[PDB]
Design a protein around this ligand. Structure first.
Ligand SMILES: Nc1ncnc2c1ncn2[C@@H]1O[C@H](COP(=O)(O)OP(=O)(O)O)[C@@H](O)[C@H]1O
Ligand SMILES: Nc1ncnc2c1ncn2[C@@H]1O[C@H](COP(=O)(O)OP(=O)(O)O)[C@@H](O)[C@H]1O
Ligand SMILES: [Ca+2]
Ligand SMILES: [Ca+2]
Ligand SMILES: [Mg+2]
Ligand SMILES: [Mg+2]
Lengths: 126, 57, 74, 371, 160, 57, 371
């Protein structure tokens, strides 16, 4: 009905979508904690002499280097993906830019400034 | 601009009608071609048998 | 040339990431502390890799969206 | 800070800050010294009235344009015009503002180098950039292809562009423009008895041309009609009375554009140099150029030119191609609007010729990478 | 923009009563009783500044966009908050991309009738099927049942 | 109205493109039909000749 | 997982997942850098348009094929083409898919070794296999014998096969193909006045050749008929109008296949190199090869070639043998359909060149048992 009414409705829709995205982030962080506790085999460090501790630490470093390599490869892939996303965003913008340059004129005085100039200080909202 | 738009839309309608007719023709000719392909295969089998009998004779 | 150089650089970077693990001069308590360090490092790598998975999936989705927008442009 | 989008032009200087819709100050570019003696003492008489002030005291001045055909022939007067434009019409010191001049295609190098040297030494701007007057007019239309015919007051040039790649071998620059039409109108008015000779009366003839002349759709039919009926004779009141009646001089003045043989020029009209400029382009981008023909510049404001030109090109071009002529209502300021848009871009912000660069390579920097 | 209305949110239409009184201080004698704001701004201008009725046209056009021709008080509020915009564009367009991803749980890159319908149902907004189709075509500009990122931005353009 | 004209033009262009494609397809398939019919006629003649040869031999 | 059946070809790259009927993405293999200067800023102009994108902006590009005659002459451009094919036309990362390239017979070794080295190092595929372009075309026909004439766009080769045993001493590779026919057509069009020179206009001449040219059943009779009547002159509309009329250039362009003396080549036509390829085979499999002559490749799509070739071979061959020419309607994609069938086989699943094998023996693994 009213333009302000539809704008308020869109604002409420934005709030709903923001809450749903916050719910998504909460799910993401919870699953992050779950998977981090699951994948990482605990520190079973009870009643061990020196030598088995050395063996365990060496195998830990080996697996650390392995997973570092895996995460490094995934990071390279993600960098490639984001570079592609940026380049194709530029491509789409080239397909959908051009005229979209902001044709804005400074002869348009801000209403608050005009109100203050004409009325001194009795334009307190604006 | 309005006159040009009207003429363009009329052209588009005519082209759509032509496309429908072409689709009909294509399907009909495709069916006929399949039938004649089967006929030619029968011809080939007949020729094979005749050739074999000629060799035997 | 460069692809072979890419492999060489990759494996050298991984080797640098391999830290000199030395515990033979440490008491077994220090050994357990080092093991805790190694497990925490592996946990950090797991978290980083999972975040990379999530962001990679996000990037794939945005790539699909870009393809759809291109189809609209076509 | 904001950039100053100046546009020297030849006949009207248009300037204003980047990012607006219309130039802030538009005024003729004439500098006129007084010519009589002067007897009143203490009247405060200056030695040279420039800009719009000399269009009000033109009765006792000798106005002389400092820009003949795109090129600048009198550097002191041009410096005076720029100084006036910066200090009195915009009131912004140039020490704190980048500038974006405009220049016609195929102009002498020395003109451009002197322009940049003046802007960097006298006015001492932070950074200035020179752009071709047709690319801006293509910016303003919001296109990215098209062949633009920018028939100014000094020189008419026709730059074809495709997908952002300008074609330098297909620029056809012709020196017939509004000034020659004013002179030809002043020359054919003498056939009825009205003689305008003084350089001040050239302004009156220019006003007559602007307010009355129009481009005929078909020339011979109009010549036959104006010679039988009297439905065309429109009258006009001089600055002192004594109304005049213009007969078939109305559509004969701007017809010179399509038949430059009237003023003795050999070349072909603006209807055929566009087709020639298209035909020099590659065979695969001719359809797009045919469909996106752009008009700009002041002189293309004659009532009825966007139809005559389309009829002529349709006669010349192959029958299958569609010929469309883009004639925006804001034709006169199209170049300046495009200049504002270009200066407002973020991608363009690193193309300015910074002052330290000029200090290292001299004025010849303009021909280098920073074009 | 939003600050003015928010600080006047606890108050009723009497803001427009004060606006009318202030106009009567300058431009008393309205004839249409309908949308006419060029006159008051022009009278403000005639006090010595540079003439510019383009601002008057902008402000008098910012009110009527619904296409029904009406200019409501709420439309006046929209015009006032839109003549100077501060917290606009729904803040971050990255958040817009996140919300569009939320819409496309199928990750197909096209928001369908089902996606928008279920999003509205989650918001629960009661909009008529005529307005439903209106908003759809606002999103689905080409009206093919699919909405890409650009169409979603168009639908949520100026939405915050 | 200008936007409407653009939409009409693009619709007409698409329709004409589809029409051209259908024309090409129909041409190809009709040529195939003609060739196969000629082959079938020759095959009938060859079959009669082969039967005559069988009898005489 | 599924295998990627790519097929480099020369003129059209055809690719798609194994197990389908038609290639998913077919697009010309051209990479064209822009050649003009470019004045619009921020237009998003790339440095090289590849594939089907450069067939729409060809008006301002200089298209150049990266594959001349089967062999690859410009490895960087070929790598660019492959990268485009994998990422934008199929959108499947190569890290998770085997690939099956195709290669003409009798090609230089270095080409094949470089191809496998690229596929294993840059794109990092799991396993790739290279197959001869004629065996696949024999797969697609569902035969197991027959002599296949695969007249592509780069090179025409004629591989005879019997009972699955290829005859390596009877392969006759001839370098006349579609590209030389395009050049010869472009050269004989000049006899009427139409001059095509630019590398972009070669595409227009190719379109003319595809849409109008046909192979004459008898050459002299057609030359006599076209010189008396005018029932052959078919017209064609250029990309800008100005229709052209092709007379006896229609059947003279593809006649070069049967008389390579037209373009100065010494060798015999495709009608006689097939007979020579047959006669090199053993005396007991000549009847089967005569009866199962297979046509493939794009250039064998001329209307009326399956009759001219049969007439010629029947003239050459002994009178008793039956000459039959298999010309499936899906000729153009025959090689790729055969490639899909071969990649879909279970028996073939252990012939791929696994990556660990390449790591142990280097790129020279392709010449070894894994052929
Ligand atoms: N409304 C008009 N009708 C006809 N001619 C005009 C009109 N306005 C300007 N002109 C002509 O155009 C010239 C102004 O052209 P302009 O575009 O200002 O040149 P420049 O490119 O130097 O700025 C004037 O000299 C006048 O002769
Ligand atoms: N319908 C057709 N009629 C005539 N010639 C054609 C036709 N289609 C393609 N050609 C020719 O064949 C070439 C394509 O051959 P193709 O089989 O794609 O080569 P490749 O073996 O490299 O894939 C084109 O260059 C064209 O000259
Ligand atoms: Ca979706
Ligand atoms: Ca849509
Ligand atoms: Mg100009
Ligand atoms: Mg091939």
């Amino acid at each position: 009905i009213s333009a302000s009414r539809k704008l308020q409705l869109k604002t409420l829709m934005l709030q709903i979508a923001k809450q749903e995205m916050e719910r998504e982030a909460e799910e993401r962080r919870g699953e992050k904690g779950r998977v981090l506790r699951t994948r990482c085999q605990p520190l079973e460090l009870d009643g061990l002499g020196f030598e088995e501790l050395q063996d365990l630490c060496r195998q830990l470093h080996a697996r650390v280097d392995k997973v570092d390599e895996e995460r490094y490869d995934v990071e390279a892939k993600v960098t490639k993906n984001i570079t592609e996303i940026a380049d194709l965003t530029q491509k789409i913008y080239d397909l959908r830019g051009k005229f979209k340059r902001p044709t804005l004129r400074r002869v348009r005085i801000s209403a608050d400034a005009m109100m203050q100039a004409l009325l001194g200080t009795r334009a307190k909202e604006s | 601009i309005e006159s040009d738009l009207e003429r363009a839309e009329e052209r588009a309608e005519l082209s759509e009608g032509k496309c429908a007719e072409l689709e009909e023709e294509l399907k009909t000719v495709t069916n006929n071609l399949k039938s004649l392909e089967a006929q030619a295969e029968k011809y080939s089998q007949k020729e094979d048998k005749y050739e074999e009998e000629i060799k035997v004779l | 040339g460069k692809r072979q150089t890419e492999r060489e650089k990759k494996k050298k970077i991984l080797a640098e990431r391999r830290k000199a693990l030395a515990i033979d001069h440490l008491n077994e308590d220090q050994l357990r502390e080092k093991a805790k360090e190694l497990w925490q490092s592996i946990h950090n790598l797991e978290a980083e890799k999972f975040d990379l998975q999530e962001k990679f999936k996000q990037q794939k989705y945005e790539i699909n969206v870009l393809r759809n927008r291109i189809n609209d442009n076509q | 800070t904001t950039a100053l989008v100046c546009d020297n032009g030849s006949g009207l200087v248009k300037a204003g800050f980047a990012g607006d819709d219309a130039p802030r100050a538009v005024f003729p570019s004439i500098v006129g010294r007084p010519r009589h003696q002067g007897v009143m003492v203490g009247m405060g008489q200056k030695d040279s009235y420039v800009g719009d002030e000399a269009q009000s005291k033109r009765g006792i001045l000798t106005l002389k344009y400092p820009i003949e055909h795109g090129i600048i022939t009198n550097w002191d007067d041009m410096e005076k015009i720029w100084h006036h434009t910066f200090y009195n019409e915009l009131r912004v010191a140039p020490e704190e503002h980048p500038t974006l001049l405009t220049e016609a295609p195929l102009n002498p190098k020395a003109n451009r180098e002197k322009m940049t040297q003046i802007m960097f030494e006298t006015f001492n701007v932070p950074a200035m950039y020179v752009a071709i007057q047709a690319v801006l007019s293509l910016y303003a239309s919001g296109r990215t292809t098209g062949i633009v015919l920018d028939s100014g007051d000094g020189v008419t040039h026709n730059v074809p562009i495709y997908e952002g790649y300008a074609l330098p071998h297909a620029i056809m620059r012709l020196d017939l423009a509004g000034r020659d039409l004013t002179d030809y109108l002043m020359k054919i008015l003498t056939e009825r008895g009205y003689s305008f000779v003084t350089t001040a009366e050239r302004e009156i003839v220019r006003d007559i041309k602007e307010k009355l002349c129009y481009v005929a759709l078909d020339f011979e039919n109009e010549m036959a009609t104006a010679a039988s009926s009297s439905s065309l004779e429109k009258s006009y009141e001089l600055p002192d009375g004594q109304v005049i009646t213009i007969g078939n001089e109305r559509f004969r003045c701007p017809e010179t554009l399509f038949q430059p043989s009237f003023i003795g020029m050999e070349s072909a009209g603006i209807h055929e140099t566009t087709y020639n400029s298209i035909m020099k382009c590659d065979i695969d981008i001719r359809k797009d150029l045919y469909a996106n023909n752009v008009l700009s510049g002041g002189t293309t404001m004659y009532p009825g030119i966007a139809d005559r030109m389309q009829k002529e090109i349709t006669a010349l071009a192959p029958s299958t191609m569609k010929i469309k002529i883009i004639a925006p209502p804001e034709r006169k300021y199209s170049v300046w609007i495009g200049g504002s848009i270009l200066a407002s871009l973020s991608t363009f912000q690193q193309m300015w010729i910074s002052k330290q660069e000029y200090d290292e390579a001299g004025p010849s920097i303009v021909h280098r990478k920073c074009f | 923009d939003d600050i003015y209305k928010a600080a006047v949110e606890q108050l009723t239409e009497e803001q427009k009563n004060e606006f009318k009184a202030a106009f009567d201080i300058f431009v008393l004698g309205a004839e249409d009783g309908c949308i006419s704001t060029k006159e008051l701004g022009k009278v403000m201008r005639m006090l010595g500044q540079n003439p510019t009725p383009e601002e008057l046209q902008e402000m008098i056009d910012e009110v009527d966009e619904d296409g029904s021709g009406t200019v409501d008080f709420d439309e006046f509020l929209v015009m006032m908050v839109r003549c100077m915009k501060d917290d606009s564009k729904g803040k971050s367009e990255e958040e817009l991309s996140d919300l569009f991803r939320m819409f496309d749980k199928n990750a197909d890159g096209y928001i369908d009738l089902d996606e928008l319908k279920m999003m509205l149902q989650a918001t629960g907004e009661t909009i008529t099927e005529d307005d439903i189709e209106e908003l759809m075509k606002d999103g689905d500009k080409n009206n093919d049942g699919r909405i890409d990122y650009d169409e979603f931005l168009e639908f949520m353009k100026g939405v915050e």
